[PDB]
Amino acid sequence: GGLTCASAPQGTLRILEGPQQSLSGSPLQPIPASPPPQIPPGLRPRFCAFG
């Protein structure tokens, strides 16, 4: 009436919960790159010679 060893298991199942990968879009930056410093339009000379 006691507990005895039974037949060895024939296989093992290991369960884990996993989600999946999306598409590669690689959206690097809101406003991207190093935007260049640049000329103010027209500007004009702010200096003249004497005479």
Binding site: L16, P19, G25, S26, P27, Q29
Partner: protein, 63 residues
């Protein structure tokens, strides 16, 4: 063969602030080859004294 997917899943949780993964957990996965490289294994640090720095996570754009 589950370590890569696990590291990527854990990195996606911290970026999107899902689960309870701290926004700053370091999911590290030092791969193992046959070469005498650093000891293999998946570490996960969340302690209060490490240095961190922001980087724009591509494929999610989520800093």
């Amino acid at each position: 063969d589950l370590a890569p997917g696990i590291a990527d899943s854990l990195r996606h949780f911290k970026v999107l602030r899902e689960k309870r993964i701290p926004p700053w957990m370091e999911v590290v996965l030092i791969p193992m080859t046959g070469k005498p490289s650093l000891y293999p294994g998946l570490f996960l640090f969340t302690t209060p004294c490490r240095l961190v720095r922001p980087v724009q996570n591509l494929a999610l754009g989520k800093e």
